[PDB]
């Protein structure tokens, strides 16, 4: 197979993504959920982990780590401590709203995924870290959790298999840095959302010191479908080591911003011209595209023509996949102002525990504000690049790298616009 995309409705993972059907237990069980879960729980954690590993499912959070190996990290005998599975439902990344749609429209799929994942790694219970701002989503999730509890699917003797499994929902308090898995673990324990250092990994010391595995909503809710349809069914899509279907949130200067499921290795041009309704003012009006939300560098029109929206093609285009969040900027935009606002957002969401991010993000904010104003010298632009090289790779967590990447991409792709802006200011003001 060479042409990737044009996914039929028979292969979409998340039916009722648009909320047109019932989201409760009677609606979810009529769409295929909660079917033959007892045999899945009874077959074996080794079989479930092997089926996940053969499927080639990778990280849907944006890190790109393979899910099967990471889930099999905790497949070890216990030392007397309980084991925990935690679902990351914070989703503080700009441009990203797919997990909100999953927790608002398919909560029972998330609960069945929690049960299947907890069976796979022998977890004692499940914790869902919902976002604080998603109050209605959390209420709907807890309604579905109660409806699944009163049906005997979870709890004591879950799904009639003799395996106990408990589920919890914990609300956040408005912090994007709580989306990091170690900062999420620290936030559940009742401290500030300040990340830990690896090693020790969460598979050894996690929440409450117990072995704990943290996984995204989109990589948990697909696990019962992974077990039911089979590994090769998910491996049929995309390129090699890029299998699966992805939710894409397209927003920006676009006629119809929307969330849509598609194949992994679909070209970006086909997706943005088919599902998004096209760039405003035609294709020639397009100026830049950020393919993964605020964590990834942008790419101009010269790279956006024949780019495949998977991990390998995007990492070959000196950017990252991110959370498949397509932010589109046309020619009627102040691009430097947009990157300055992104950097100011990164300044307003940074825990401040470790020094290089805590100082360099503020320094980058001042430099980019002066660049938007234009009050600098041109060589300082190159100096700003060096500041990024003093942040990327010297931080506790990846928020500093996630702030250094868009500045590097903006400089590397639109240095002429920056320098012409500031020399125009220098001419017209001095």
């Amino acid at each position: 197979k060479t042409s990737f995309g044009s996914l039929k409705d028979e292969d979409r993972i998340f039916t009722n993504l648009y909320g047109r059907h019932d989201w409760r237990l009677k609606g979810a069980q009529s769409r295929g959920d909660w079917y033959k879960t007892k045999e899945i729980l009874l077959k074996g954690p080794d079989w479930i982990l092997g089926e996940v590993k053969t499927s080639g499912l990778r990280g849907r959070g944006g890190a790109g780590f393979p899910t099967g190996l990471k889930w099999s990290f905790m497949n070890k005998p216990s030392d007397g401590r309980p084991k925990y599975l935690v679902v990351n439902a914070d989703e503080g990344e700009p441009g990203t709203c797919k997990d909100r749609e999953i927790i608002r429209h398919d909560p029972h799929k998330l609960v069945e995924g929690c049960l299947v994942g907890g069976r796979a790694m022998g977890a004692r219970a499940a914790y869902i870290y919902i976002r604080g701002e998603f109050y209605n989503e959390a209420s709907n999730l807890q309604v579905a959790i109660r409806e699944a509890y009163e049906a005997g699917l979870i709890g004591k003797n879950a799904c009639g298999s003799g395996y106990d499994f408990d589920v919890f929902v914990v609300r956040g308090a408005g912090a994007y840095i709580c989306g990091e898995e170690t900062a999420l673990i620290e936030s559940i324990e009742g401290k500030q959302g300040k990340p830990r250092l690896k090693p020790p990994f969460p598979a050894d010391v996690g929440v409450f010191g117990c072995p704990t595995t943290v996984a995204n909503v989109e990589t948990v809710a697909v696990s019962p479908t992974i077990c039911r349809r089979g590994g090769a069914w998910f491996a049929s899509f995309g390129r090699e080591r890029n299998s699966g279907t992805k939710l894409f949130n397209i927003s920006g200067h676009v006629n119809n911003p929307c969330t849509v499921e598609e194949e992994m290795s679909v070209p970006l041009k086909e997706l943005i011209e088919k599902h998004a309704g096209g760039v405003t003012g035609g294709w020639d009006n397009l100026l830049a595209v950020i393919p993964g939300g605020s964590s990834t560098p942008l790419i101009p029109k010269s790279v956006c023509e024949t780019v495949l929206m998977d991990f390998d093609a995007l990492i070959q285009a000196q950017t990252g996949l991110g959370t498949a969040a397509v932010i589109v900027m046309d020619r009627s935009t102040d691009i430097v102002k947009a990157i300055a606002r992104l950097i100011e957002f990164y300044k307003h969401e940074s825990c401040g525990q470790c020094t290089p991010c805590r100082e360099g993000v503020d320094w980058m904010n001042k430099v980019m504000a002066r660049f938007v104003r234009g009050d600098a010298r041109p060589a300082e632009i190159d100096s700003l690049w060096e500041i990024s090289k003093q942040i990327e790779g010297h931080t506790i967590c990846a928020l500093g790298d996630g702030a250094a990447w868009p500045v590097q991409g903006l400089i590397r792709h639109f240095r002429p616009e920056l320098e012409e802006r500031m020399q125009r200011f220098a001419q017209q003001h001095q």
Binding site: G19, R20, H21, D22, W23, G27, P82, R104, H105, R124, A125, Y135, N136, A138, S139, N140, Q142, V143, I145, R146, Y149, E150, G155, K156, D164, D166, V169, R171
Partner: protein
């Protein structure tokens, strides 16, 4: 039949301030006994 032109998430308009908390209070009766570390706090 089949309906595809109506939004079914109409319950979220009728949520009060304490719906999450009272839902947790009602759901607390279905939960397993929590494990014990041997002490009531690490500061003990």
């Amino acid at each position: 039949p089949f309906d595809n032109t109506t939004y079914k998430n109409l319950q979220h308009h009728d949520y009060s301030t304490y719906t999450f908390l009272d839902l947790n209070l009602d759901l607390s009766k279905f939960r397993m006994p929590q494990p014990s570390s041997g002490r009531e706090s690490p500061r003990h």
